[PDB]
Scaffold this motif. Structure first.
Motif, PDB file in Angstrom:
ATOM      1  N   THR A   1       0.789  -1.230   0.000  1.00  0.00           N
ATOM      2  CA  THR A   1       0.000   0.000   0.000  1.00  0.00           C
ATOM      3  C   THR A   1       0.828   1.292   0.000  1.00  0.00           C
ATOM      4  OG1 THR A   1      -1.728  -1.255   1.162  1.00  0.00           O
ATOM      5  CG2 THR A   1      -2.025   1.137   1.018  1.00  0.00           C
TER       6      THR A   1
ATOM      7  N   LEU B   1       1.589   5.251   0.505  1.00  0.00           N
ATOM      8  CA  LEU B   1       1.299   6.196   1.583  1.00  0.00           C
ATOM      9  C   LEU B   1       0.182   7.164   1.177  1.00  0.00           C
ATOM     10  CD1 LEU B   1       4.960   7.015   2.711  1.00  0.00           C
ATOM     11  CD2 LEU B   1       3.366   5.522   3.913  1.00  0.00           C
ATOM     12  N   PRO B   2      -0.831   7.326   2.050  1.00  0.00           N
ATOM     13  CA  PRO B   2      -1.963   8.227   1.806  1.00  0.00           C
ATOM     14  C   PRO B   2      -1.558   9.692   1.909  1.00  0.00           C
ATOM     15  CG  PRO B   2      -2.070   7.317   4.020  1.00  0.00           C
ATOM     16  CD  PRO B   2      -0.994   6.567   3.307  1.00  0.00           C
TER      17      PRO B   2
ATOM     18  N   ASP C   1      -0.695   5.706  14.441  1.00  0.00           N
ATOM     19  CA  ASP C   1      -1.972   5.288  13.867  1.00  0.00           C
ATOM     20  C   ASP C   1      -3.076   6.073  14.571  1.00  0.00           C
ATOM     21  OD1 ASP C   1      -3.515   1.979  13.234  1.00  0.00           O
ATOM     22  OD2 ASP C   1      -4.091   4.002  12.608  1.00  0.00           O
TER      23      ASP C   1
ATOM     24  N   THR D   1      -9.510   6.264   8.845  1.00  0.00           N
ATOM     25  CA  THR D   1      -9.081   5.685   7.574  1.00  0.00           C
ATOM     26  C   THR D   1      -7.961   6.557   7.005  1.00  0.00           C
ATOM     27  OG1 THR D   1     -11.433   4.805   7.153  1.00  0.00           O
ATOM     28  CG2 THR D   1      -9.755   4.861   5.266  1.00  0.00           C
ATOM     29  N   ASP D   2      -6.797   5.941   6.794  1.00  0.00           N
ATOM     30  CA  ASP D   2      -5.649   6.579   6.130  1.00  0.00           C
ATOM     31  C   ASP D   2      -4.976   7.731   6.885  1.00  0.00           C
ATOM     32  OD1 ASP D   2      -6.497   6.134   2.569  1.00  0.00           O
ATOM     33  OD2 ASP D   2      -5.870   4.714   4.122  1.00  0.00           O
TER      34      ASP D   2
ATOM     35  N   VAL E   1      -2.427   8.189   9.052  1.00  0.00           N
ATOM     36  CA  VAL E   1      -1.210   7.626   9.634  1.00  0.00           C
ATOM     37  C   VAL E   1      -0.061   8.624   9.455  1.00  0.00           C
ATOM     38  CG1 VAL E   1      -1.863   5.194   9.445  1.00  0.00           C
ATOM     39  CG2 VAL E   1      -0.766   6.321   7.492  1.00  0.00           C
TER      40      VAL E   1
ATOM     41  N   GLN F   1       2.871   0.716   7.229  1.00  0.00           N
ATOM     42  CA  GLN F   1       2.291  -0.297   6.349  1.00  0.00           C
ATOM     43  C   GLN F   1       1.376  -1.259   7.113  1.00  0.00           C
ATOM     44  OE1 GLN F   1       1.264  -2.067   2.798  1.00  0.00           O
ATOM     45  NE2 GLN F   1       2.587  -0.254   2.996  1.00  0.00           N
TER      46      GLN F   1
ATOM     47  N   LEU G   1      -1.926   0.457   7.842  1.00  0.00           N
ATOM     48  CA  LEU G   1      -2.758   0.515   6.642  1.00  0.00           C
ATOM     49  C   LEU G   1      -3.327  -0.852   6.280  1.00  0.00           C
ATOM     50  CD1 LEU G   1      -0.540   2.910   4.462  1.00  0.00           C
ATOM     51  CD2 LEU G   1      -2.725   3.530   5.543  1.00  0.00           C
ATOM     52  N   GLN G   2      -2.529  -1.898   6.492  1.00  0.00           N
ATOM     53  CA  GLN G   2      -2.921  -3.266   6.160  1.00  0.00           C
ATOM     54  C   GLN G   2      -4.057  -3.812   7.018  1.00  0.00           C
ATOM     55  OE1 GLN G   2      -1.962  -5.732   3.747  1.00  0.00           O
ATOM     56  NE2 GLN G   2      -1.052  -3.992   2.653  1.00  0.00           N
TER      57      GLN G   2
ATOM     58  N   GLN H   1      -6.289  -1.712   8.896  1.00  0.00           N
ATOM     59  CA  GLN H   1      -7.230  -0.659   9.290  1.00  0.00           C
ATOM     60  C   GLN H   1      -8.714  -1.025   9.097  1.00  0.00           C
ATOM     61  OE1 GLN H   1      -6.353   3.075   7.285  1.00  0.00           O
ATOM     62  NE2 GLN H   1      -6.798   2.239   5.248  1.00  0.00           N
TER      63      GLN H   1
ATOM     64  N   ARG I   1      -6.695  -4.045  15.603  1.00  0.00           N
ATOM     65  CA  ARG I   1      -5.844  -3.084  14.900  1.00  0.00           C
ATOM     66  C   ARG I   1      -4.533  -2.845  15.662  1.00  0.00           C
ATOM     67  NH1 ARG I   1      -9.609   1.795  12.486  1.00  0.00           N
ATOM     68  NH2 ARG I   1      -7.573   2.397  11.615  1.00  0.00           N
TER      69      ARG I   1
END
Ligand SMILES: *[C@@H]1O[C@H](CO)[C@@H](O[C@@H]2O[C@H](CO)[C@@H](O[C@@H]3O[C@H](CO[C@H]4O[C@H](CO)[C@@H](O)[C@H](O)[C@@H]4O)[C@@H](O)[C@H](O[C@H]4O[C@H](CO[C@@H]5O[C@H](CO)[C@@H](O)[C@H](O)[C@@H]5O)[C@@H](O)[C@H](O)[C@@H]4O)[C@@H]3O)[C@H](O)[C@H]2NC(C)=O)[C@H](O)[C@H]1NC(C)=O
Ligand SMILES: NCCCC[C@H](N[C@@H](CCc1ccccc1)C(=O)O)C(=O)N[C@H](Cc1c[nH]c2ccccc12)C(=O)O
Ligand SMILES: *[C@@H]1O[C@H](CO)[C@@H](O)[C@H](O)[C@H]1NC(C)=O
Ligand SMILES: *[C@@H]1O[C@H](CO)[C@@H](O)[C@H](O)[C@H]1NC(C)=O
Ligand SMILES: [Zn+2]
Length: 598
Positions: A297, A299-300, A326, A330-331, A333, A357, A360-361, A363, A370
């Protein structure tokens, strides 16, 4: 009936998990604001929100007794309820919790605010650990300068905080017993869901220990040639200030003076990074690239918008010790790192992005899931990639390593360099928690707390302070994690399992074959490998939904923590080093240190 209740319980959990994520978001924001900007106002805010979340957790733990969860059919539901029963510090009475929070911020802020005076300029007294003091410890070869900075830092980061640390131990113990653990040691160990975990680690450590002794002996021999026998003795513990690190946890910074073959290449890409115009932004972009190349994934935007990747240039106090965050939406991070353009820092970036990562994996998981399969899993992710980025293979690809001939001697140099970080660290990591466990368990009287620390460092690592210490000093909190109340066993676990992950990822990538001389484990590059990434996706997406052996099984079919992989990686070094030490009549082992007066 229990049939109808288990249906209602599932609905209860779905709602509560969402509520917990949202409440923890608020806490995390306050903690982020404080770590990025240490003020009395932000401390107050951080702690008061945590007190509010603790109060809610108490109500939750109380509400779980309304459900017959131990009677349920669903292993998943029972696992979630069990996670909710575990209060940790939130089990403490309101007032005791507030005191602990105040004690913890007092220690962390003390550490973060440490400033020392210049060795050569007693008027310039604004030198911080990051970057000023760490620069000296890693670069200076003036043993008296090194001893000065060691003493100044330990006195300010360690000793100043003794009374706060004592009260912390008391309240950590009280919290553990309110959760019906014997002590904070057992509370920490519970995270590994294995009642034989300590013995397993003892067994693994004992297998690797002989190799550590060989490395220690050879390093000491080489340091004697550099500093002379007035500074380093043949038979005694190594004076720790000579090892290139404030805590002697990793010795890679002195590789230039202890490398097996000094006339052959030793990888140090910091100079080329500067020459090519590397920036903190470019380093994080390259880390992002490595992950996405494995089909993992990206990075957001929140990460780029909200992260702190350079030390602020204003007057402010902050925690520079690198961390990944975290925020449980959502996203959202973030990383906070006081990034410098060095080889070591390039690895640190990859380590921190490994945490990101994982966030994100998993979430999409319920809140209680989590987190890592166990704390060691979270620490291993980024290190697996760092093992690849550190290879001559990868560093040549990115043009950071030039005119490199990978002969037998260069290979030993690189293997030795890796071991100075990976093997040397193992006894260090074990002692951080062996020490704290012994205090938590009430095994050491308060009058003996400091020398109990140095006794462990002697017994396991064969290192000692540069100057005589006593019970008038208190040196443990000079290490970030000890002041910041961060469990350390995760790193020992990580340094073992990261090689299990690495070996499997390399096999999957077609980068490692034990019967092919062209594909050695120590030159494996998993960049661009979708297959390796797939194994990571399989494991990381699970979060803590299953006990960790199931998460390991999702990666490579194995269920057991094993030292086989790390020993396999270093086997060529072991063979060479054992022979080299015999060739040079190198003394192995050490006499008991005289540097802590009881
Ligand atoms: C850590 O360990 C601690 C023990 O060392 C533990 O503390 C115990 O928790 C118990 C709750 O699980 C609690 O037990 C209750 O006791 C009440 C009476 O206690 C009095 O006498 C004690 C002397 O022994 C004193 O110490 C107390 O101060 C009190 O004066 C009972 O009233 C109570 O009962 C009720 O609840 C049970 C519920 O049990 C189930 O109920 C379901 C129904 O849904 C049944 O289907 C099922 O079969 C099962 O029975 C009911 O059965 C009953 O009808 C009552 O409603 C209960 O027994 C105990 O007091 C407490 N302390 C001690 C010293 O024992 C901590 O909880 C542990 N902490 C953690 C975090 O795990
Ligand atoms: N110069 C190296 C800095 C590495 C940052 C890291 N920091 C930790 C932060 C832990 C934390 C817990 C709770 C609140 C805030 C922060 C981490 O990200 O794991 C850490 O503590 N790291 C190391 C141990 C370590 C394991 N892998 C590494 C790979 C490369 C370098 C170091 C390590 C340390 O003992 O210093
Ligand atoms: C740091 O926090 C203070 C108050 O604690 C705030 O006024 C200030 O704006 C912050 N500084 C920066 C640079 O964000
Ligand atoms: C990338 O990952 C997705 C799922 O995350 C998978 O379906 C796809 O096959 C992967 N790409 C490759 C080339 O394997
Ligand atoms: Zn980490």
């Amino acid at each position: 009936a229990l049939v109808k209740e288990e249906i209602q319980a599932k609905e209860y959990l779905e709602n509560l998990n969402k509520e917990l994520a949202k409440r923890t978001n608020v806490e995390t924001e306050a903690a982020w604001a404080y770590g990025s900007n240490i003020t009395d106002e932000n401390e107050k805010k951080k702690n008061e929100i945590s007190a509010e979340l603790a109060k809610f957790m108490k109500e939750v733990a109380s509400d779980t007794t309304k459900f017959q969860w131990r009677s349920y059919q669903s292993e998943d539901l029972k696992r979630q309820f069990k996670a909710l029963t575990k209060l940790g510090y939130a089990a403490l009475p309101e007032d005791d919790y507030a005191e602990l929070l105040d004690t913890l911020s007092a220690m962390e802020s003390n550490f973060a605010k440490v400033k020392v005076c210049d060795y050569k300029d007693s008027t310039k007294c604004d030198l911080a650990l990051d970057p000023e003091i760490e620069e000296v410890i890693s670069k200076s070869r003036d043993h008296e300068e090194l001893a000065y900075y060691w003493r100044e830092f330990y006195d300010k980061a360690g000793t100043a905080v003794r009374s706060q640390f004592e009260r912390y131990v008391e309240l950590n113990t009280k919290a553990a017993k309110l959760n019906n653990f014997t002590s904070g040691a057992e509370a920490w160990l519970d995270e590994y869901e294995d009642d034989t975990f300590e013995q397993q680690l003892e067994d693994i450590f004992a297998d690797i220990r002989p190799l550590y002794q060989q490395i220690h002996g050879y390093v000491r021999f080489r340091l004697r040639k550099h500093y002379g026998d007035a500074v380093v003795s043949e038979t005694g513990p190594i004076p720790m200030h000579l090892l290139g690190n404030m805590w002697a946890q990793q010795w890679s910074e002195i590789a230039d003076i202890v490398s097996p073959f000094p006339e052959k290449p030793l990888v140090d890409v910091s100079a080329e990074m500067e020459k090519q115009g590397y920036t903190p932004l470019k380093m994080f972009q390259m880390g992002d690239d490595f992950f996405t190349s494995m089909n993992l994934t990206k990075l957001p935007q929140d990460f780029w918008d909200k992260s702190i990747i350079e030390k602020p240039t204003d007057g402010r106090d902050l925690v520079c010790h690198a961390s990944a965050w975290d925020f449980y939406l959502t996203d959202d991070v973030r990383i906070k790192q006081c990034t410098r353009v060095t080889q070591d820092q390039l690895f640190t970036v990859h380590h921190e992005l490994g945490h990101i990562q994982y966030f994100l994996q998993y979430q999409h998981q319920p809140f209680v899931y989590r987190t890592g399969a166990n704390p060691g899993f979270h620490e291993a992710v980024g290190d697996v990639l760092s093992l690849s980025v550190s290879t001559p293979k990868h560093l040549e690809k990115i043009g950071l390593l030039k005119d490199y001939v990978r002969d037998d001697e260069a290979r030993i140099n690189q293997l030795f360099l890796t071991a100075l970080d990976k093997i040397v660290f193992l006894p260090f990591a074990f002692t951080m928690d062996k020490y704290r466990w012994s205090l938590f368990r009430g095994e050491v009287d308060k009058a003996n707390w400091n020398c109990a620390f140095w006794k462990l460092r002697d017994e396991y690592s064969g290192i000692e302070p540069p100057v005589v210490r006593s019970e008038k000093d208190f040196d443990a909190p000079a290490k970030y994690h000890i002041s910041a109340d961060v469990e350390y066993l995760r790193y020992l676990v990580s340094f073992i399992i990261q090689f299990q992950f690495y070996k499997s990822a390399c096999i999957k990538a077609g980068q490692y074959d034990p019967d092919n001389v062209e594909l050695p484990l120590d030159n494996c590059d998993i960049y661009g490998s979708a297959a390796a990434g797939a194994a990571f996706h399989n494991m990381l997406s699970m979060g803590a939904s299953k006990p960790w052996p199931d998460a390991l099984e999702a990666f490579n079919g194995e269920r057991i923590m094993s030292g086989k992989a790390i020993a396999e990686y270093f086997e060529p070094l072991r063979v060479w080093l054992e022979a080299e030490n015999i060739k040079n009549n190198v003394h192995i082992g050490w006499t008991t240190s005289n540097k802590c007066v009881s």
